[PDB]
Amino acid sequence: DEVD
Amino acid sequence: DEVD
Amino acid sequence: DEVD
Amino acid sequence: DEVD
Amino acid sequence: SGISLDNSYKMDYPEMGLCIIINNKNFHKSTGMTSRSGTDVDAANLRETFRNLKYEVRNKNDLTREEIVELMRDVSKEDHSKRSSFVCVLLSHGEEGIIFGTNGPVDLKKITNFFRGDRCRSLTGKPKLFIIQACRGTELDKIPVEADFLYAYSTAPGFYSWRNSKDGSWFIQSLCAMLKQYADKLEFMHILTRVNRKVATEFESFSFDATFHAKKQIPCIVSMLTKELYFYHH
Amino acid sequence: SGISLDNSYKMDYPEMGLCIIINNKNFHKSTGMTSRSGTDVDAANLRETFRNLKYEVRNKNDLTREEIVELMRDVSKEDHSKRSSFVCVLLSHGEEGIIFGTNGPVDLKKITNFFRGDRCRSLTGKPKLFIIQACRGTELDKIPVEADFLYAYSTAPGFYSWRNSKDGSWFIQSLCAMLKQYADKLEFMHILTRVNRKVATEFESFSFDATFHAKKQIPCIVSMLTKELYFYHH
Amino acid sequence: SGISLDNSYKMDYPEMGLCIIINNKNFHKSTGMTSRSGTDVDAANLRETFRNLKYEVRNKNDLTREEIVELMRDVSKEDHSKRSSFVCVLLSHGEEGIIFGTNGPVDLKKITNFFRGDRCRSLTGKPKLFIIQACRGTELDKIPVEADFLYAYSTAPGFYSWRNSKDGSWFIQSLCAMLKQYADKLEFMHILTRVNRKVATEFESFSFDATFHAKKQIPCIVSMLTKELYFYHH
Amino acid sequence: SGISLDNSYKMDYPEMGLCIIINNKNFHKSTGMTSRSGTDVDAANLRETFRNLKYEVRNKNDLTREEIVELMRDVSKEDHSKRSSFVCVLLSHGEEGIIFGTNGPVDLKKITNFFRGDRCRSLTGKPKLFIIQACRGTELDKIPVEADFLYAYSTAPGFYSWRNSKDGSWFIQSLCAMLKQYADKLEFMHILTRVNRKVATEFESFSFDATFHAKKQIPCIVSMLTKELYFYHH
Secondary structure, eight states: OEEO | OEEO | OEEO | OEEO | OOOOOOOBOOOOSSEEEEEEEEEOOOOOGGGTOOOOTTHHHHHHHHHHHHHHTTOEEEEEESOOHHHHHHHHHHHHTSOOTTEEEEEEEEESOEETTEEEETTEEEEHHHHHHTTSTTTOGGGTTSOEEEEEESOOSSBOOOOOTTTTEEEEESSOTTBOOEEETTTEEHHHHHHHHHHHHHTTTSOHHHHHHHHHHHHHHHOOOOOSSGGGTTOOOOOEEEEOOSSBOOSSOO | OOOOOOOBOOOOSSEEEEEEEEEOOOOOGGGTOOOOTTHHHHHHHHHHHHHHTTOEEEEEESOOHHHHHHHHHHHHTSOOTTEEEEEEEEESOEETTEEEETTEEEEHHHHHHTTSTTTOGGGTTSOEEEEEESOOSSBOOOOOTTTTEEEEESSOTTBOOEEETTTEEHHHHHHHHHHHHHTTTSOHHHHHHHHHHHHHHHOOOOOSSGGGTTOOOOOEEEEOOSSBOOSSOO | OOOOOOOBOOOOSSEEEEEEEEEOOOOOGGGTOOOOTTHHHHHHHHHHHHHHTTOEEEEEESOOHHHHHHHHHHHHTSOOTTEEEEEEEEESOEETTEEEETTEEEEHHHHHHTTSTTTOGGGTTSOEEEEEESOOSSBOOOOOTTTTEEEEESSOTTBOOEEETTTEEHHHHHHHHHHHHHTTTSOHHHHHHHHHHHHHHHOOOOOSSGGGTTOOOOOEEEEOOSSBOOSSOO | OOOOOOOBOOOOSSEEEEEEEEEOOOOOGGGTOOOOTTHHHHHHHHHHHHHHTTOEEEEEESOOHHHHHHHHHHHHTSOOTTEEEEEEEEESOEETTEEEETTEEEEHHHHHHTTSTTTOGGGTTSOEEEEEESOOSSBOOOOOTTTTEEEEESSOTTBOOEEETTTEEHHHHHHHHHHHHHTTTSOHHHHHHHHHHHHHHHOOOOOSSGGGTTOOOOOEEEEOOSSBOOSSOO
């Protein structure tokens, strides 16, 4: 999971 | 007619 | 006194 | 050169 | 039992819920804000409309920024266990993300945060509707804590919102008319879509000032709802 | 003919319309922006989904801010007379009101303004859908020219938006799944509401960093549409 | 010649330069903005003050947003080759980053951009001073193209700015008094610092409304100047 | 005694005061923020510079948003009675009005509010200097509680700020050089003006990416000070  |  |  |  | 679906909010609780209407017409002279002529027509229209929807309506008039926050805080601390939803209508001057108390602005986030899923447990998983008749600028034309919120904005982001001194605001006039005609037939988003069309096609400003003349308006539905919302049940 | 109603957009034009997918994965080193691992999964998912909806899909990869504006300008200057609608999907980094080109930001208003009712006549009165998978901040959990626009935001205002390096973004994964399952049955707002529920209930972040761990997300539907939107017809 | 230093702006050109004073007192009724009582006192005070500094003063009254932009554009297209500097004074209602025309807002950036080092060559390397008496919110208490700009804000970011209906605004009253007393002795930043102290210590609001009563104010000097600025020379 | 003037801050207290340097170089992977190569050069440069000015320097490295707030809160709760001033240097990534902790953003107002005239009494009437090396956007080139604050921004509002991986940031390099050379001769605003000229004339970016190549920068001095500030006394 990564944020944009 | 009037704006808020 | 009044605000702008 | 790099931006902060 | 037979197959069950969870596509729509449970609206058959003992009570539909509260409908808080904050009607700000007269502002403190120091704010330099004009009186919102026609807003009483809106407040009365909304009271009647939501009364027919079986909401427990509480009309508040000319509340200061302090009173607005206190009211919302107090309301959010009530036990909404037997209530299906929550409705808050704000009629006042405003800017993008802001609504005016009679003596100054209130961040809309401040008001809405009280009802976040983790801050008002008796409303968690229930639809929290905020209907806002206020300008949003000066242009002329476990579950997420932010989930289950619906913002029915009278105008698009960055734009002025129109109010007629005699008939009330374009948005509220249209909203009430559509709720009266379709609340027992259509899902809420479809009702708000009719409101969008009514405002966009049936209204145009008339002003002696060319700058504010012949202008149009389009409301803005902002949904963080997770289910369909019908005001009627069973 | 018999009684006619105009509650839904005319979607039986010769073509459904264009579906422009801007997939920005790799950014110029000078921007300091990370590669968006998993976005290719999203782009492919969207291409297939909209292909089945009969949209003329055009996938663009790694476009600079200049290329994005030029593309949108050029697309808005095309003749959309025989097209029912317009869809633009933006997959990139972003901030509130901003989407990143590979070399810098682009104001979302800049992009959307090209399609305003008075600037793109062949699309006037037709639904213009902008689906945006990008962060909108750093929080963790005659007709109006602005009419007929639908903004399907992946996350609420001011919040980060989540993307899985293997499965793609939470929002796009859910959107495509809901479009595949309900595009031939439900009105668009109801499909986006299912997307909201899917994202809000089926996803939670897992991070070695406590700050970004166990976080939730809720998409944000912003509608300025004036009619119901069904992807199917007759 | 002997040792030469370039620590201060060359102010011995044939002309000191223009001093454009935009005095907006009466606003179009549709804007809902109050008349700025006392602003005429400010405009007259500034005219006299800058007249004594040998500036070519041009007083403009009640300009619309269109007229403001056109005026600034036209002024920026003039030949300032024989002018030492440029001064623009804005007296009107405002918000953060905004100044009001009689019929609507104008982005301050819009106005200032006309004088950027690359857009107004005859002013490149010369001090461009923008003195702004307007609110910046509602709180109560080769060379860079942006170089050589000085913004003398009447109040801190996000705060209201005070104006007395009889004596004029606190900031302008103080600015003119300090310019009159120290323009032939002190460097400009030191003069503005005296203005800060005068406003902060000699003024306090008196209002029948507790919300706006006994409030203080602190101006805000924003400097992008690259040299010291003395109004006198040789 | 003879005639007394109060045009400059009393800087002869037993201690000059604290100089808190928050040096954030490495950020949590989840933030997606790059390592700020060269910032250690800045931190060391500042430590030495302020050490020579007799400030009690406290260098902090890689602080989270929580740690930054806690540190500032704790520092603001200290007894500064015997201290002449307060200096806080922030070296990190940033946006307009924001500075990044290693795990997320911190509102600059949040940090500065702790030192407001009414919240930190032992610093009331004393100069509170905040030196900020961080981007402020993505563009390329009784007394008031807000009184007595000086914000020495590395770049103009809305612009990127440049940092050299080997020599440190343009602003900090220039600031330290000017403080070293003029702290015992010039008033602070005049020193910052020299810093503006040095940055604006002696630096230009070199990048393999045309978008970020040959760019210039101009710092931004924001003063709410009420008196002149000399680092030396008697």
